[PDB]
Ligand binder design. Structure first.
Ligand SMILES: [Mg+2]
Ligand SMILES: [Mg+2]
Ligand SMILES: [Mg+2]
Ligand SMILES: [Mg+2]
Ligand SMILES: [Mg+2]
Ligand SMILES: [Mg+2]
Ligand SMILES: [Mg+2]
Ligand SMILES: [Mg+2]
Ligand SMILES: [Mg+2]
Lengths: 114, 120, 48
RNA sequence: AAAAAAAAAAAAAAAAAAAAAAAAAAAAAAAAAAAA
RNA sequence: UCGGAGUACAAAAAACCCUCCGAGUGAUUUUAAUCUAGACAAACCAGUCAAAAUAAUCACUUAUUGAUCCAAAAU
RNA sequence: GCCUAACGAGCCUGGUGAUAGCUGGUUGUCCGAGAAAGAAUUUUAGUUCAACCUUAAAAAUACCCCAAAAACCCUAAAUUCCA
């Protein structure tokens, strides 16, 4: 009996998208925080956005997650319109990641007393 | 040598700055603030202030924006902050009131476009 | 349609770029590129 | 015969294919309801 | 071989001669550089982000790709 | 077909302890600790990596783990992560 199943190429590995660090994790500058294919979490304070929508930590610190108000860039039109048609009482919210800096910025050392 | 917050960037405006010039145009009054990333309002010039209120006519005028501009310039120098960032909107940047706000600011001696960070 | 691999030549020195071009030839290839030796912005010309 | 412009000034309306987006402020603390 | 869904409902992973859609490139212009912290991913090989320091986009965008050796070429 | 009681290619001696990812065997006693299939592969009767594991060594935290936290329409048992 002809057993042809017409479907092809279901097979891909998973991309291991997801959250790499968790709230209250210590982080060094450069660590990737989470990696996603669509924006699930947006970059907050001290979190840089990679061209593939990676989130990495800019400072040395503690990673925090947050629900905050979303005010799209006036250059990006779709989001501008989505913001436009809302009923007059409602604001948009999203989830952000943050780094909270640990090390102080610097120190004043006494080099020489002349 | 301090920190800014390099970040956000799905949102607007860019929150990287020490001092952000903020200009709110109400249908009535022109208000200009200078803010710290902490949200604190450092130095402000508003029209509802009796000082600017009594000295001139028609609050919504381009003239009143020049005025609030150089009043905030004066007050800024007195506060010793010579550097702040301004992020107007694409449509806002073309209006006369704002061009004259920026000219009042420049003649005042106040430099926009904040100096870079050292070892960022 | 096809894709042609073309080798660009800089005005000065031995700097050589390699890039792809279109069969239909939408935009003929002439570039402003970076030369390492003089550390400059250059005019690169399409060659073989 | 029962309670005074559409906070102590501020924040819809009106004038450069049809829309949409660079004038104005209870009167002299002590004029809505419920009984031939 | 390569990628999107489901199966696999909320960190990752996850099978079939399972259920369904795709790719072995187009379209532009703005020619999208060097050098180095820290990372994801990962048997290995391949894959990925990227601060500081010097001086690419749209097409669901994600897939548009082949290791050594050996050949031709010029620098 | 037949070529000396086995001819799809004679018999013998060499090469020759041919070569078998395939069967079959592998010898005293007593104690410690102990494994279940992720990848590629003329690969799926096999190998070579990872993971688990055994024997030594050096160290510092390991499991368990309350809040808090992880998405957008609907979405159970539950996960991940931490004092
Ligand atoms: Mg799949
Ligand atoms: Mg798979
Ligand atoms: Mg070719
Ligand atoms: Mg840089
Ligand atoms: Mg015989
Ligand atoms: Mg043998
Ligand atoms: Mg092979
Ligand atoms: Mg075998
Ligand atoms: Mg723990």
């Amino acid at each position: 009996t002809g057993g042809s199943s017409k479907n092809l190429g279901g097979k891909s590995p998973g991309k291991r998208f997801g959250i790499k660090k968790m709230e209250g994790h210590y982080v060094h500058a450069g660590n990737i925080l989470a990696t996603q294919r669509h924006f699930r979490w947006h970059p907050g304070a001290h979190v840089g956005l990679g061209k593939n929508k990676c989130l990495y930590a800019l400072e040395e610190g503690v990673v925090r997650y947050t629900k905050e108000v979303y005010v799209p860039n006036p250059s990006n039109s779709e989001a501008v319109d989505l913001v436009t048609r809302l009923p007059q009482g409602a604001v948009l919210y999203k989830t952000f990641v943050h780094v909270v800096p640990a090390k102080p910025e610097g120190t004043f050392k006494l080099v020489a007393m002349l | 040598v301090a920190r800014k917050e390099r970040g956000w960037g799905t949102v607007w405006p860019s929150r990287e700055f020490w001092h952000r010039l903020r200009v709110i145009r109400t249908q009535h009054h022109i208000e200009a603030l200078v803010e710290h990333r902490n949200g604190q309002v450092v130095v402000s010039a508003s029209t509802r202030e009796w000082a600017i209120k009594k000295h001139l006519y028609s609050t919504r005028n381009v003239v009143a924006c020049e005025s609030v501009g150089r009043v905030l310039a004066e007050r800024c120098l007195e506060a010793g902050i010579n550097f702040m960032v301004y992020h107007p909107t694409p449509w806002e940047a073309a209006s006369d009131s704002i061009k004259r706000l920026q000219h009042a600011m420049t003649e005042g001696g106040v430099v926009l476009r904040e100096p870079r960070r050292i070892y960022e | 349609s096809k894709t042609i691999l073309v080798k660009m030549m800089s005005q000065a020195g031995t700097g050589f770029s390699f890039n792809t071009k279109r069969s239909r030839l939408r935009e003929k290839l002439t570039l402003l590129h970076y030369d390492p030796v003089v550390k400059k912005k250059v005019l690169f010309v399409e060659q073989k």
